[PDB]
């Protein structure tokens, strides 16, 4: 009869037994190079120019388009739940504010600046990070100040970016994260802050590695998902240019790149960003019961921490400030 | 009026201009450390004991539970489309074949061995990889040979694993991939092959890094998604023990770990495995139009190549053998 | 005889207790001896007793000697920084799952060496009673 | 009866026997990467403006507030005991010398400069190190020249610091140790010395790593006890800026950081500073008989040498110049 064959082994090498190091549930806490806490989570905010707004956006999101008058209620619960930071994204809906130079960008009476002043007063505890791009304030919608019916006019767009960056910081924002990818914008934003004597209080959180994929929206300067050599030269570049921290995005799909950042920008806090695409992807998957959201949120977010990051920009912030409180 | 401020810059540093290296669509081919070809794709197969089977499995899959008599039709088209390899997973459905020692594992009249002989004859071109685990041939369903109402009896389960591994190879399989995680099973499988004079023809493709998460099935020895130090000691261990290649799994969620494998096991082919969970997740997301499948399949699969891998075990094989043929 | 520690014997005896504890229900065993080769032996012992996959060997790889345990055997010289590296590298290969550095505050540099040498192993800091007091 | 069980061992590996390398009391001299000598010790001095002063300070100290006329007696014994260096700290007690620019800092008729001229004549053997800070010469007491009811005005405070630094060196001081932490003050002090043709005779001993803790005094720019990445970027920065040597402080509590300095600033003499807090802590502990001072002084000071340092700024200098002479 077919009988089970069993080869004849050798005494177990001591160097083949790693098992005893990850056997108890607490040893899987002991094996984590870094544990997920609440002061790591960074909540993005889309502050609208309509002071009464609170319009749900979507793809699978639960995030919105809030306004300066609904702000104190949205933030309040969260902050009490221990929220330490937020990254502002302004959304001007007024019929005549976009244009050929994103002039309305640093607009003292804009969503972002009128959001940065609201927080600094109604929630002086919070830490403010402002995305710095001309994307949403230009008629064409391009990320920079364009040339004749073509490409981005580098120097100009950069000369304009540093401008807004310092304007935000003058307004009261703690950190400025330029999401352009336009060459040399950190050296320039760094100088600008310097001239304005604001370099010792503003944290330059650069988007050193922003790739291009179907994860922002479905379907300018933006790195090739395969160019792994560029992402290293760009990280190494922003680091020397003055970046205080680095952002990798997307996240889950670029964990290896988060690994390169960890080795290259070793003395700089590395930040992981869960792009809306991934967010709307975990969710959609969760509804079709492919995976349990909460189960896939931790796995996916501890991968950020494992991969190298010590900070995280995610929409699952509301949910984590809850979860993290738990024990059994 | 609020006028656009523009700071005063410095002449563009030559070391801030990487842009010209990724501007043309061909330079994004030129920037890839490695291009995705067809002899990289490895198609998994679930060979059932019912010779007429062809039962669709599911979670979002398009994969099945085929039988030795439907095999020549399923494989034929694919192979013509240039398929070079497949990883066999046997599924015994007979009412009395599982048990306390997965005896039916190396069963000369089983799905896998009666699948390995079919291929070697009707498709002598193909390259055969066989998963080696007692998971599916045991009554308890555990990955190994258990002790009294507890844990896996290491040595025994290992003594039994090497057995099946050599039996497969004697049957005609080119490669044996042990998916156990039971300490020291590569040294033992390697020896076994050696004693049987089959070490110079069999490719030991180890599952050096198999983590645990909600991506195999929704909701034994298996690494903590956070234990990044163990995964390195386990890779370094299987490499010295004789592993010819290494498999990382899951894939997308462990790209950083695929990066560590690339540095640690530098002279060994690294293989990326797109777990069914991720597969069923890209799909579910695609149906809810969060992303275009084809768009997210390449991004996600070139990340394997970027991250470090030169081989890929994926269910999207049918689709890639198509796509890869294309140009515009 | 009216001298030194009889290595092999003391070690043969240590592995004994170590496995006895683990048989009793203890999750981890931290040998605070400094007697050469006691991790290889404790590791084997656990192995023979099929307890190697559930016990966490937390070794005292770097135990120095100073006025910090009690005021005023094998124990490393507060200055021997080269030994502490060879001893850490030794217990790591011998099977240690984690490493303990002690004392702590006064050996932060040594905790730094452990971090580079035993990079994939959890490093544990011990605040000796002397520092505490 | 409960009998002692003794497992059955294997023959002692030769690579488990390090013991014979540290068995004799002389081999613990042979195992030290560096031995503590007297020309390593650097004695700090608080020279008061009252030429007859000799006021005991305190927390647990035995150090004082000496004056230019008591100086020849305090120093004399020490120097004979083989003292090679001292780091001057001036203490102006006159009722009208502090102010908005620490003008009295480089004051030709001040404690420090009237201390630097005393030594160069009554003890031409000694080596003079001068701390360079505006801390003690400003009305506000801040370490730098302040802006409007806020922060330190970088450039100005720096422009003022380099000034004093060169003034000291012109006075006859061999070394200048800037204890500011104000960004870029080494490049500037280095240049200043250069312009004044004093760069080839002055030793720039920078306080590259000055952290903040309860060890200076109980309870400005100063590094976070946890920021280990900053301390490396700051060390690497002062090294390129011209620092000839680097000071780490505090010491005992930052031995790991002394370790980083040793790797980063490998070709630069590393100096360890036993902050008064630690000094007053060893002492207090000694009185409450928790440890024998002399026993804890060597351990703690050889840790400096082990950790990386080849120089030491400590108040236990008087005592060491004694001890070091001993044998049995
Ligand atoms: Pb943009
Ligand atoms: Pb845009
Ligand atoms: Pb299995
Ligand atoms: Pb199973
Ligand atoms: Pb000061
Ligand atoms: Pb001060």
From Swiss-Prot, chain C:
Note: Present with 11600 molecules/cell in log phase SD medium.
Domain of life: Eukaryota
Role description: Catalyzes an early step in the biosynthesis of tetrapyrroles. Binds two molecules of 5-aminolevulinate per subunit, each at a distinct site, and catalyzes their condensation to form porphobilinogen.
Gene: HEM2
Subunit structure of this chain's protein: Homooctamer.
Modified-residue entries (Phosphoserine), positions: 93
Coiled-coil portions: none
Native species: Saccharomyces cerevisiae (strain ATCC 204508 / S288c) (Baker's yeast)
Binding site for 5-aminolevulinate 2: 129
Family, similarity comment: Belongs to the ALAD family.
Active site residues according to the UniProt entry: 63, 102
Protein's name in the database: Delta-aminolevulinic acid dehydratase
